[PDB]
Symmetry: C4
Subunit: 82 residues, 4 copies
């Protein structure tokens, strides 16, 4: 699958996660972007997490749509620097 397509897909995931957390959980755009990366990479520090039922549902959706996409993106990126 073309590396550039995978890039657009992960970017779309990042936008989805970031806007969602910002609007549902009320954290700043910067914190929301950070939380999105920490979540889809499966790091999960837990310094930020959803505190509402809608936020919990949303986070589950992001986990399902985002973890795989991020994993493929990382691996494709490996190919280019390595």
């Amino acid at each position: 699958v073309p590396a550039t397509r995978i890039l657009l897909l992960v970017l779309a995931v990042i936008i989805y996660g970031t806007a969602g957390f910002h609007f549902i959980e009320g954290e700043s755009w910067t914190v929301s972007l950070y939380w999105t990366f920490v979540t889809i990479a499966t790091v999960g520090y837990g310094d930020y997490s959803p505190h509402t039922p809608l936020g919990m549902y949303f986070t589950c959706t992001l986990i399902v749509l985002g973890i795989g996409t991020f994993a493929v993106a990382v691996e494709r990126l490996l190919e280019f620097l390595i």
Copy 2:
């Protein structure tokens, strides 16, 4: 392995994790479902976690039965949206 079979398997994991956490740790059904996804995806925020020995044992079982199943499910889902 047929994607729909993997779907049923991950659904069964999700039911197992959610009912187990709800009954053993006493959190709500919604929190327990959320915790199940957060656990089997290996995110592990830690906003929720078991506080009893039985809950700890149970969580180890869920980790072993669930992490692989979820990974395969994510990868199969990748195939279909992509």
Copy 3:
């Protein structure tokens, strides 16, 4: 690699992690076993973590020796139930 050999390897990792955490960080055997699974599975709730320099070094060693071993063990287990 024979599935049973992988089983022995992950059991050895679990023993190493559990005894190490118990003796270095002073948590109970049960908590230490749970923490070991939570760590080598990469869940990392953070309800338990090392608070000493030796514990931090030890945890890095467990991460390096344990995460791959657990990953291979999970995948092999998948094959037998699936």
Copy 4:
């Protein structure tokens, strides 16, 4: 890819992560090395995490550059002890 090259790459990631956390977030060299492993392995206990915008940005960079590199390094190490 030669295992020793992968070794150098992960060592470089570890240096990057450790110095970055130490200087941006102000934690000790030891805590910063520990946090780097905990992050690039995707464990993410959350006992340590960035509390500044620059730290958050930096952590996202380390996640992208480090998680893949660490995964390949673990897998190569598997080959040699096994």
